[PDB]
A and B are shown apart, each in its own frame.
Chain A
Amino acid sequence: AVKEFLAKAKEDFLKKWETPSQNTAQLDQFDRIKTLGTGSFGRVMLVKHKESGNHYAMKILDKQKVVKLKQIEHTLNEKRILQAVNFPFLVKLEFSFKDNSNLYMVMEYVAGGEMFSHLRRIGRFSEPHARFYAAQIVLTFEYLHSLDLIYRDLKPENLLIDQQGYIQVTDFGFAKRVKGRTWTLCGTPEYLAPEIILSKGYNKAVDWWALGVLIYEMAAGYPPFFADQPIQIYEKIVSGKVRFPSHFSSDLKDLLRNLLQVDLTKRFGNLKNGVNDIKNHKWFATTDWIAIYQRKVEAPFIPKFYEEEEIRVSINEKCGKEFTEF
């Protein structure tokens, strides 16, 4: 029953992870409607797949710009992850391909909002609203960890709010498949777990720390460790000092004491009972975990629903070496 899917989810992921799909569509299969946005590496275009009639958000990444901005490994890693994972709170890569000039990531079209701008505009979320979004991160990390993936870049900036007001994780540049320990310094200063700063190796428990930072930031409107310069943030994080706003519930303070636990060996999510120490915490008492997974809970916020330049694809292959695996 429960054993059936967790095994099968992992087998489907591993097959795709070990042999990634490449060039699963091509440019002439899409009608180009308009530019939705401009990214670091190029544009995002609204496209219509000619055969299905479905709309997609086609991210176009200029290979030369990815190389210049030193985002090669991050771009390859994100695409390799996105073509292998399948979970309700992870963005859906529908097709990928490359040509002489560009990489193309054809994403499910989401006319939503960004968690970052919504949270900053609202200021702070109520505990019930924060809990709704938090539950989705708990299930998403349970899923990623079951595949030995460490996410290691949680922050509001990496979460969209979709058309039904659920969140989707949008960025996988840093995520790593690893059994046990890894060392790479990455993330954003305010979300670094103490064991990252201590620079002696860390494991998937850094994700549960980051969940603590996100829950605090959602409920307070500011994160637990901040300062005008990073060095002082790193000091506060390893210092093991945190102060909760007087409006935090006692249940929220208890959860965050156990997630913002400097000793990864005592941190919730990293003990014998794993994710259940979090799911069965009093702060989540009202949470229907299966109904969140099935997206049956009513979300608290539903987002509100001659510019064209042509795509020129060079005659000559650019950066063939760097993007061979894409």
Chain B
Amino acid sequence: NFNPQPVDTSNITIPEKLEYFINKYAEHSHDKWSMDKLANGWIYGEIYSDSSKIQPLMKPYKLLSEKEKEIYRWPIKESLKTMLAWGWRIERTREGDSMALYNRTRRISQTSQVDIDAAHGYSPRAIDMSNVTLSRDLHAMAEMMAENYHNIWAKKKKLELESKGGGNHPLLVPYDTLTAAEKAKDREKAQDIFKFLQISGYVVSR
């Protein structure tokens, strides 16, 4: 009976004003990717080789091609299209939370050439949104997005198996029957975009 039907976004147009957010979140996501590659012992390298862990995409976002940017941009746009297809409103309320996060402590005239030199290279440090809290309503909305990511995966998987006449996946079940550990990936993706919208000055409402 399990019949996942994620909302059709095929005819949604993202307003041009959200381009600012899509670019900012895509760059954050790329920097987070690079940090994780540095932490697993990968390093930049002009020419790609899986041997010795060299990754030529471990460079600033602005240098990436359209194609390489799309790895981040495509899912972000898909996420926004779902919200818009549900009739949710996405409004930029303020700027990127400048004051609240600014350290207002008295500043000493201390500088290091070591930091200065490091700033010439690619030195990714994506914001840690671990401190960032969602309202009760925004948590429920994030859970609905998480569920919809599962349903997108599930419908695609089901059509694949139906097309072949074979295959079986144990996670082809209703989202809520999943364990926390099984939900965690869709939960973290949903929560990530809601948290990044928030720190970027956006309010999602329904």
Contact = CB atoms under 8 A, between A and B. Distances in A.
Contacts of A222: 98-99, 102, 104
A91 to B, nearest CB: 17
A53 interface: no
Interface in B93-149: 95-96, 98-99, 102-104, 106-113, 115-119, 123, 125
Nearest to A246: B95
A59 to B, nearest CB: 18
Interface stretch (A75-83, A141-149, A180-188, A263-271): A180-188
The CB with the most chain A CB atoms within 10 A, among B103, B109, B118, is that of B109
Contacts of A230: 111-112, 115, 119
A116 B105 CA distance: 10
Given A116-B106, A157-B107, A229 B125 contact: yes
Contacts of B106: 116, 157
A187 B96 contact: no
Interface stretch (A27-35, A189-197, A303-311, A315-323): A189-197
Interface residues of A, number: 33
Nearest to A229: B125
Contacts of B116: 185, 197, 199, 234
Contacts of B118: 231
Contact of A221 (B99, B108, B110): B99
B-side binding surface: helix, strand, loop or mixed?
Answer: loop
Given A187-B111, A188-B111, A190-B107, A231 B95 contact: no
A-side binding surface: helix, strand, loop or mixed?
Answer: loop
Contacts of A174: 109
Contact of A231 (B103, B113, B119): B119
A188 B110 contact: yes
A230 to B, nearest CB: 5
A222 to B, nearest CB: 4
A231 B111 contact: no
Nearest to A223: B102
A243 B111 contact: no
Given A234-B116, A243-B95, A243-B96, A185 B123 contact: no
B109 A226 contact: no
Interface in A204-255: 220-223, 226-232, 234-235, 238, 243, 245-246
Interface in A28-86: none
B98 A235 contact: no
Contacts of B104: 120, 222
Contacts of B103: 226, 228
A153 interface: yes
Nearest to B127: A228
B106 to A, nearest CB: 6
A16 interface: no
A130 B119 CA distance: 31
A257 interface: no
Nearest to A116: B106
Contacts of A176: none
A231 B102 contact: no
Interface string B180-196: 00000000000000000
Contacts of A116: 106
B109 A188 contact: yes
A234 B115 contact: yes
The CB with the most chain A CB atoms within 10 A, among B96, B98, B112, is that of B98
Contact of B102 (A186, A189, A226, A245): A226
A155 interface: yes
Interface of A: 116, 120, 153, 155, 157, 173-174, 185-190, 192, 197, 199, 220-223, 226-232, 234-235, 238, 243, 245-246
6 contacts: A153-B109, A155-B107, A185-B111, A230-B115, A230-B119, A246-B95
Interface of B: 95-96, 98-99, 102-104, 106-113, 115-119, 123, 125
Report the 3 A-B pairs with minimum CB-CB distance, sorted nearest first: A234-B119, A222-B102, A230-B115
Given A186-B111, A188-B110, A226-B98, 15 more contacts: A174-B109, A185-B113, A188-B107, A188-B111, A190-B107, A199-B113, A199-B116, A220-B99, A222-B99, A222-B104, A230-B115, A230-B119, A234-B116, A234-B119, A243-B98
